[PDB]
């Protein structure tokens, strides 16, 4: 089935730098009282190309339930 | 050409003599 390890034999330094950059970019900070800012046409076009704009058709709430 | 300094050190050198 599925299994994992907490201490893997992978490289050590890369995990530390990935975690540190994860704290430096994300941290834990959420926000809710914020109005969304519009992206320019360049970021919008790149988001179109990468295919991350697709609606979550996987979720069978109402998107896939009729199909 | 590959001279050996003690404590096991191998040093490559120039051509010959």
């Amino acid at each position: 089935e599925i299994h994992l390890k907490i201490v893997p034999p992978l490289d050590k330094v890369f995990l530390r730098w990935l975690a540190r950059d994860l704290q430096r970019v994300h941290g834990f900070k959420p926000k809710n009282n914020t109005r969304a800012i519009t992206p320019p046409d360049s970021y919008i076009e790149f988001m179109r190309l990468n295919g991350s704009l697709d609606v979550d058709l996987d979720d069978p709430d109402l998107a896939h339930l009729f199909k | 050409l590959t001279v050996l300094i003690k404590r096991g050190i191998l040093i490559l050198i120039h051509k010959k003599a």
Binding site: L49 | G8, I9
Partner: protein, 218 residues
């Protein structure tokens, strides 16, 4: 790497344990340096500063510029293989694998729409005999235009147009490591500005000298 191989690393006094009743002068700092009551710290010459600090020898390499491999130990400095007699393909390929084939001769020449079109698209389509998808071509073009931001900003800040310090801070904001070494960006703005004004008045007085030097032989 802590001296990059140059060896002339900068030094700085970080903290000073001043006696109660004195002022932070320079001679008191020197006297503390005599008795080592000030924190002497090493700054790399890779960091370039507004004030050139004393550049002395790097203690990590003793001025040679290299660190010996301390991971290798004296007990295992020798092997048993007769690989040294038959010159292998893998040693040559490995020693040549750290030569990088330095691509700077095309990256700088690449900054042209027609030339970028050629190198990026036309050559792979001709040599490989394939054809790109439109997603591939458009992602190449987007990543290219995204990469050209720094050189466009460098060209714009090279004009010395009024208000160029804002574009200077934009350059130091977009990419730290490259802006730490760009010779166009000046570390101290009032330095360059007042030196420019002083050079203007200096060529004014140079014109005065070179114009009154021609009024005495007549």
């Amino acid at each position: 790497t802590m001296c990059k191989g140059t060896g002339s690393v900068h030094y700085q006094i970080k903290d000073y344990n001043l006696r109660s009743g004195e002022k932070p002068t320079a001679d008191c700092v020197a006297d503390a340096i005599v008795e080592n009551r000030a924190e002497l710290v090493h700054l790399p010459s890779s960091f370039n500063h507004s004030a050139p600090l004393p550049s002395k020898d790097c203690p990590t390499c003793d001025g040679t510029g290299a660190m010996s491999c301390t991971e290798c130990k004296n007990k295992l400095q020798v092997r048993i293989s007769a690989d040294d007699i038959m010159e292998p393909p893998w040693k040559a390929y490995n020693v040549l694998k750290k030569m990088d084939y330095p691509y700077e001769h095309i990256v700088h020449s690449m900054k042209d729409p027609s030339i970028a079109n050629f190198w990026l698209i036309t050559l792979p389509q001709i040599v490989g005999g394939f054809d790109y998808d439109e997603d591939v071509k458009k992602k190449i073009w987007w990543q290219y235009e995204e990469s050209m931001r720094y050189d466009q900003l460098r060209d714009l800040v090279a004009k010395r147009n009024p208000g160029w310090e804002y574009l200077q801070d934009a350059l130091v904001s977009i990419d730290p490591v490259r802006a730490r070494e760009d010779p166009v960006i000046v570390k101290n703005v009032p330095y360059y500005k007042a030196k420019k004004s002083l050079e203007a008045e200096s060529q004014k007085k140079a014109q005065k000298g070179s114009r009154q030097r021609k009024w005495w032989f007549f």
